[PDB]
Protein backbone atom coordinates (compact mmCIF):
# COMPACT_ATOMS: atom_id res chain seq x y z
CA UNK A 1 0.00 0.00 0.00
CA UNK A 2 1.04 3.64 -0.87
CA UNK A 3 0.19 4.50 2.82
CA UNK A 4 2.74 6.76 4.54
CA UNK A 5 2.97 8.62 7.84
CA UNK A 6 4.91 11.89 7.62
CA UNK A 7 6.89 14.24 9.91
CA UNK A 8 9.41 17.06 9.55
CA UNK A 9 12.72 16.78 11.51
CA UNK A 10 11.91 17.90 15.09
CA UNK A 11 8.16 17.02 15.11
CA UNK A 12 6.66 13.96 16.81
CA UNK A 13 5.75 11.06 14.47
CA UNK A 14 2.38 9.38 14.98
CA UNK A 15 2.09 5.79 13.64
CA UNK A 16 -1.32 4.13 14.30
CA UNK A 17 -2.05 0.63 15.59
CA UNK A 18 -5.21 -0.94 16.92
CA UNK A 19 -6.87 -4.12 18.22
CA UNK A 20 -10.17 -4.93 19.93
CA UNK A 21 -9.82 -6.95 23.21
CA UNK A 22 -11.99 -10.16 23.14
CA UNK A 23 -13.37 -9.03 26.52
CA UNK A 24 -12.92 -5.74 28.46
CA UNK A 25 -9.65 -5.89 30.42
CA UNK A 26 -8.11 -8.78 28.37
CA UNK A 27 -5.04 -7.07 26.87
CA UNK A 28 -3.06 -8.79 24.08
CA UNK A 29 0.79 -8.40 24.18
CA UNK A 30 2.01 -5.89 21.60
CA UNK A 31 5.47 -5.01 20.34
CA UNK A 32 6.90 -2.16 18.24
CA UNK A 33 10.17 -2.32 16.38
CA UNK A 34 12.13 -0.52 13.66
CA UNK A 35 11.87 -2.59 10.44
CA UNK A 36 9.16 -4.88 8.98
CA UNK A 37 7.62 -7.69 11.12
CA UNK A 38 9.89 -10.80 11.21
CA UNK A 39 8.93 -14.53 12.06
CA UNK A 40 8.16 -13.55 15.63
CA UNK A 41 8.46 -10.58 17.99
CA UNK A 42 9.87 -7.27 16.72
CA UNK A 43 12.91 -6.45 14.68
CA UNK A 44 15.00 -3.94 16.70
CA UNK A 45 12.32 -3.59 19.47
CA UNK A 46 11.57 -0.11 20.88
CA UNK A 47 8.47 -1.01 22.99
CA UNK A 48 6.65 -4.11 24.30
CA UNK A 49 3.51 -4.81 26.36
CA UNK A 50 2.10 -7.97 27.90
CA UNK A 51 -1.37 -9.11 29.13
CA UNK A 52 -0.90 -6.67 32.14
CA UNK A 53 1.13 -3.52 31.12
CA UNK A 54 4.34 -2.24 29.33
CA UNK A 55 7.27 -4.62 29.94
CA UNK A 56 9.96 -3.00 27.63
CA UNK A 57 10.26 0.68 26.93
CA UNK A 58 12.62 3.11 25.22
CA UNK A 59 12.84 6.91 25.42
CA UNK A 60 11.04 8.84 22.60
CA UNK A 61 8.91 5.77 21.79
CA UNK A 62 5.58 5.93 23.82
CA UNK A 63 2.01 4.48 23.77
CA UNK A 64 0.12 7.66 24.59
CA UNK A 65 -3.34 6.37 23.54
CA UNK A 66 -5.65 4.22 25.64
CA UNK A 67 -3.58 1.04 25.15
CA UNK A 68 -5.85 -0.63 27.68
CA UNK A 69 -8.72 -0.25 25.18
CA UNK A 70 -6.71 -1.57 22.18
CA UNK A 71 -5.18 1.77 21.04
CA UNK A 72 -1.52 0.75 20.74
CA UNK A 73 -0.59 3.73 18.40
CA UNK A 74 3.07 4.90 18.72
CA UNK A 75 4.50 8.39 19.32
CA UNK A 76 8.16 8.94 18.31
CA UNK A 77 9.12 12.27 19.81
CA UNK A 78 11.72 14.68 18.27
CA UNK A 79 12.36 12.81 14.98
CA UNK A 80 15.63 12.81 12.94
CA UNK A 81 16.13 11.71 9.30
CA UNK A 82 17.47 8.45 10.90
CA UNK A 83 13.92 7.62 12.12
CA UNK A 84 12.61 7.27 8.50
CA UNK A 85 11.59 3.74 7.55
CA UNK A 86 9.23 0.84 8.18
CA UNK A 87 7.97 0.14 11.72
CA UNK A 88 6.45 -3.07 12.94
CA UNK A 89 3.42 -3.22 15.20
CA UNK A 90 2.80 -6.84 16.19
CA UNK A 91 -0.56 -7.56 17.88
CA UNK A 92 0.12 -10.89 19.59
CA UNK A 93 -3.42 -12.33 19.49
CA UNK A 94 -3.17 -15.39 21.82
CA UNK A 95 -2.66 -18.86 20.39
CA UNK A 96 -1.01 -20.77 17.56
CA UNK A 97 0.09 -18.35 14.74
CA UNK A 98 -2.71 -15.75 15.24
CA UNK A 99 -0.58 -12.60 15.20
CA UNK A 100 -1.66 -9.40 13.42
CA UNK A 101 1.51 -7.95 11.77
CA UNK A 102 1.28 -4.19 10.81
CA UNK A 103 4.08 -2.59 8.74
CA UNK A 104 3.90 1.24 8.92
CA UNK A 105 5.93 3.58 6.65
CA UNK A 106 7.42 6.66 8.34
CA UNK A 107 8.85 9.43 6.12
CA UNK A 108 11.07 12.19 7.69
CA UNK A 109 11.93 15.46 5.78
Amino acid sequence: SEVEYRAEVGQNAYLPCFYTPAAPGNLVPVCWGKGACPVFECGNVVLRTDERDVNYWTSRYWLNGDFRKGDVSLTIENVTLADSGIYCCRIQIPGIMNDEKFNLKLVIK
Partner: antibody
Framework: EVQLVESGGGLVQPGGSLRLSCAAS????????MSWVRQAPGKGLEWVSA????????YYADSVKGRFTISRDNSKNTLYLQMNSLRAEDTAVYYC??????????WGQGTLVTVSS | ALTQPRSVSGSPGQSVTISCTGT?????????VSWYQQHPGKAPKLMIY???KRPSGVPDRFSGSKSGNTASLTISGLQAEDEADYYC????????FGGGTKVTVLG
Protein backbone atom coordinates in the same frame (compact mmCIF):
# COMPACT_ATOMS: atom_id res chain seq x y z
CA GLU B 1 27.82 -17.01 31.55
CA VAL B 2 24.71 -17.66 29.35
CA GLN B 3 23.61 -21.24 29.76
CA LEU B 4 20.82 -23.41 28.29
CA VAL B 5 20.52 -27.07 29.45
CA GLU B 6 18.25 -29.44 27.53
CA SER B 7 16.89 -32.46 29.42
CA GLY B 8 14.20 -35.07 28.68
CA GLY B 9 15.43 -36.85 25.56
CA GLY B 10 15.75 -40.58 25.08
CA LEU B 11 14.15 -43.52 23.32
CA VAL B 12 10.49 -43.37 22.43
CA GLN B 13 8.42 -45.97 20.58
CA PRO B 14 6.81 -44.60 17.33
CA GLY B 15 3.46 -43.01 18.30
CA GLY B 16 4.72 -42.31 21.82
CA SER B 17 5.15 -39.10 23.80
CA LEU B 18 8.12 -37.18 25.28
CA ARG B 19 8.60 -33.84 27.22
CA LEU B 20 11.76 -31.79 26.78
CA SER B 21 12.88 -29.12 29.27
CA CYS B 22 15.41 -26.36 28.91
CA ALA B 23 16.86 -24.58 31.97
CA ALA B 24 17.86 -21.02 31.24
CA SER B 25 20.47 -18.99 33.18
CA UNK B 26 22.81 -16.04 32.52
CA UNK B 27 20.15 -13.75 31.01
CA UNK B 28 16.71 -12.22 31.46
CA UNK B 29 14.69 -15.19 30.10
CA UNK B 30 11.45 -13.24 30.84
CA UNK B 31 12.27 -10.77 28.02
CA UNK B 32 13.32 -13.03 25.09
CA UNK B 33 11.38 -15.26 22.70
CA MET B 34 12.61 -18.86 22.75
CA SER B 35 12.63 -21.75 20.32
CA TRP B 36 13.61 -25.36 19.64
CA VAL B 37 15.79 -26.29 16.63
CA ARG B 38 16.41 -29.94 15.72
CA GLN B 39 19.17 -31.74 13.80
CA ALA B 40 18.71 -35.30 12.38
CA PRO B 41 22.04 -37.22 12.79
CA GLY B 42 24.48 -36.24 10.00
CA LYS B 43 21.83 -33.89 8.57
CA GLY B 44 21.15 -30.13 8.72
CA LEU B 45 19.19 -27.73 10.96
CA GLU B 46 15.37 -27.52 11.06
CA TRP B 47 13.45 -25.01 13.21
CA VAL B 48 10.75 -26.81 15.26
CA SER B 49 8.74 -24.20 17.26
CA ALA B 50 8.95 -20.82 19.10
CA UNK B 51 7.16 -18.97 21.91
CA UNK B 52 6.52 -15.19 22.38
CA UNK B 53 8.21 -13.21 25.21
CA UNK B 54 4.86 -13.25 27.16
CA UNK B 55 4.31 -16.97 26.37
CA UNK B 56 0.87 -16.20 24.96
CA UNK B 57 1.64 -16.76 21.26
CA UNK B 58 3.30 -19.96 19.85
CA TYR B 59 4.70 -20.64 16.34
CA TYR B 60 5.41 -24.09 14.72
CA ALA B 61 6.96 -25.72 11.64
CA ASP B 62 4.38 -27.60 9.44
CA SER B 63 6.24 -30.92 10.15
CA VAL B 64 5.40 -30.73 13.90
CA LYS B 65 2.12 -28.63 13.92
CA GLY B 66 -0.55 -30.33 16.00
CA ARG B 67 1.81 -32.92 17.56
CA PHE B 68 4.27 -30.64 19.49
CA THR B 69 3.46 -27.90 22.06
CA ILE B 70 6.00 -25.29 23.21
CA SER B 71 5.44 -23.67 26.67
CA ARG B 72 7.43 -21.45 29.07
CA ASP B 73 7.60 -20.96 32.87
CA ASN B 74 9.18 -17.50 33.34
CA SER B 75 9.09 -18.11 37.16
CA LYS B 76 11.21 -21.31 36.86
CA ASN B 77 13.24 -19.88 33.84
CA THR B 78 12.32 -23.08 31.90
CA LEU B 79 11.21 -23.82 28.31
CA TYR B 80 9.26 -26.97 27.48
CA LEU B 81 8.49 -29.02 24.38
CA GLN B 82 5.69 -31.60 24.63
CA MET B 83 6.15 -34.03 21.73
CA ASN B 84 3.17 -36.36 21.07
CA SER B 85 2.44 -38.87 18.23
CA LEU B 86 6.20 -39.19 17.46
CA ARG B 87 7.70 -40.69 14.27
CA ALA B 88 11.18 -41.90 13.14
CA GLU B 89 11.53 -38.58 11.17
CA ASP B 90 11.49 -36.77 14.56
CA THR B 91 14.74 -38.64 15.55
CA ALA B 92 17.15 -35.73 16.02
CA VAL B 93 19.27 -33.72 18.49
CA TYR B 94 16.90 -31.11 19.95
CA TYR B 95 18.59 -27.80 20.69
CA CYS B 96 16.97 -25.20 22.85
CA UNK B 97 17.81 -21.68 21.71
CA UNK B 98 17.34 -17.98 22.51
CA UNK B 99 15.32 -16.85 19.45
CA UNK B 100 15.32 -13.17 19.19
CA UNK B 101 13.22 -12.01 16.32
CA UNK B 102 14.15 -15.13 14.31
CA UNK B 103 17.85 -15.72 15.04
CA UNK B 104 19.53 -17.92 17.64
CA UNK B 105 22.45 -16.30 19.48
CA UNK B 106 22.64 -18.80 22.38
CA TRP B 107 22.11 -22.57 22.09
CA GLY B 108 22.42 -25.37 24.62
CA GLN B 109 24.32 -28.66 23.98
CA GLY B 110 21.26 -30.55 22.69
CA THR B 111 19.34 -33.63 23.90
CA LEU B 112 19.02 -36.70 21.67
CA VAL B 113 15.53 -38.00 20.89
CA THR B 114 15.56 -41.46 19.26
CA VAL B 115 12.21 -42.74 17.85
CA SER B 116 12.49 -46.50 17.08
CA SER B 117 10.40 -49.68 17.53
CA ALA C 1 13.44 -22.44 0.03
CA LEU C 2 17.21 -21.55 0.67
CA THR C 3 20.01 -22.98 -1.53
CA GLN C 4 23.69 -22.93 -0.59
CA PRO C 5 26.66 -24.59 -2.41
CA ARG C 6 27.51 -28.06 -0.91
CA SER C 7 31.20 -27.09 -0.52
CA VAL C 8 33.50 -24.07 -0.92
CA SER C 9 37.27 -24.53 -0.55
CA GLY C 10 40.18 -22.06 -0.29
CA SER C 11 43.83 -21.77 0.71
CA PRO C 12 44.75 -20.06 4.06
CA GLY C 13 44.72 -16.28 3.70
CA GLN C 14 42.23 -16.44 0.75
CA SER C 15 38.96 -14.44 0.86
CA VAL C 16 36.17 -17.00 0.43
CA THR C 17 32.39 -16.50 -0.02
CA ILE C 18 29.26 -18.66 0.61
CA SER C 19 26.05 -17.74 -1.33
CA CYS C 20 22.48 -18.25 -0.07
CA THR C 21 19.75 -18.10 -2.73
CA GLY C 22 16.11 -17.61 -1.74
CA THR C 23 12.92 -16.04 -3.16
CA UNK C 24 12.04 -12.25 -3.18
CA UNK C 25 9.81 -13.03 -0.07
CA UNK C 26 12.70 -14.83 1.82
CA UNK C 27 15.96 -12.86 1.20
CA UNK C 28 14.60 -10.30 -1.32
CA UNK C 29 12.30 -7.70 0.28
CA UNK C 30 13.62 -8.32 3.85
CA UNK C 31 16.77 -7.71 5.91
CA UNK C 32 16.19 -10.91 7.96
CA VAL C 33 19.15 -13.19 7.09
CA SER C 34 21.36 -15.01 9.67
CA TRP C 35 24.49 -17.21 9.29
CA TYR C 36 25.62 -19.98 11.65
CA GLN C 37 28.96 -21.85 11.93
CA GLN C 38 29.05 -25.45 13.17
CA HIS C 39 32.14 -27.43 14.13
CA PRO C 40 31.98 -31.30 14.57
CA GLY C 41 30.35 -32.18 17.94
CA LYS C 42 29.22 -28.63 18.69
CA ALA C 43 25.97 -26.62 18.61
CA PRO C 44 25.82 -23.94 15.84
CA LYS C 45 27.30 -20.44 16.45
CA LEU C 46 25.57 -17.23 15.34
CA MET C 47 28.11 -15.52 13.03
CA ILE C 48 25.92 -12.85 11.36
CA TYR C 49 22.31 -11.73 11.90
CA UNK C 50 20.12 -9.10 10.18
CA UNK C 51 22.17 -9.55 6.90
CA UNK C 52 25.37 -7.79 8.11
CA LYS C 53 25.12 -7.32 11.95
CA ARG C 54 27.94 -9.22 13.68
CA PRO C 55 27.58 -10.44 17.32
CA SER C 56 30.38 -9.76 19.83
CA GLY C 57 32.97 -12.60 19.80
CA VAL C 58 32.71 -13.20 16.05
CA PRO C 59 35.99 -12.25 14.24
CA ASP C 60 36.03 -9.14 11.97
CA ARG C 61 36.95 -11.44 9.05
CA PHE C 62 33.29 -12.67 8.85
CA SER C 63 31.23 -10.21 6.86
CA GLY C 64 27.57 -10.52 5.70
CA SER C 65 25.95 -8.95 2.63
CA LYS C 66 22.88 -9.40 0.33
CA SER C 67 22.22 -8.52 -3.34
CA GLY C 68 18.73 -9.08 -4.70
CA ASN C 69 17.74 -12.55 -3.38
CA THR C 70 21.38 -13.81 -2.74
CA ALA C 71 22.82 -13.31 0.77
CA SER C 72 26.58 -13.87 1.05
CA LEU C 73 28.88 -14.68 3.94
CA THR C 74 32.43 -13.73 3.10
CA ILE C 75 35.31 -15.16 5.23
CA SER C 76 38.22 -12.73 4.50
CA GLY C 77 41.67 -14.27 5.11
CA LEU C 78 40.82 -17.94 5.84
CA GLN C 79 42.25 -19.81 8.85
CA ALA C 80 42.45 -23.57 9.62
CA GLU C 81 39.78 -23.01 12.40
CA ASP C 82 37.33 -21.82 9.74
CA GLU C 83 36.92 -25.49 8.59
CA ALA C 84 33.27 -25.95 9.53
CA ASP C 85 29.70 -26.35 8.23
CA TYR C 86 27.97 -23.03 7.51
CA TYR C 87 24.16 -22.62 7.38
CA CYS C 88 22.30 -19.50 6.26
CA UNK C 89 18.83 -18.73 7.61
CA UNK C 90 15.91 -16.50 6.62
CA UNK C 91 13.43 -15.40 9.28
CA UNK C 92 10.99 -13.04 7.51
CA UNK C 93 7.82 -15.19 7.22
CA UNK C 94 9.12 -18.42 8.88
CA UNK C 95 12.47 -19.79 10.13
CA UNK C 96 14.11 -21.48 7.11
CA PHE C 97 17.68 -22.88 6.82
CA GLY C 98 19.97 -23.53 3.88
CA GLY C 99 21.45 -26.96 3.14
CA GLY C 100 24.81 -25.98 4.61
CA THR C 101 28.28 -25.44 3.12
CA LYS C 102 31.44 -27.37 4.04
CA VAL C 103 34.29 -24.86 4.10
CA THR C 104 37.59 -26.72 3.39
CA VAL C 105 40.87 -24.90 4.21
CA LEU C 106 43.25 -26.39 1.55
CA GLY C 107 46.89 -25.53 2.57
Amino acid sequence: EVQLVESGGGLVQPGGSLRLSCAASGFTFSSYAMSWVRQAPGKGLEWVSAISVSGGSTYYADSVKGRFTISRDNSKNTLYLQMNSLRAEDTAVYYCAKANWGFFDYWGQGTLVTVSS
Amino acid sequence: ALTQPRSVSGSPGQSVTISCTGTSSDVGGYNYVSWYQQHPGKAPKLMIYDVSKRPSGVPDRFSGSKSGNTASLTISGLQAEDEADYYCSSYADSVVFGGGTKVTVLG
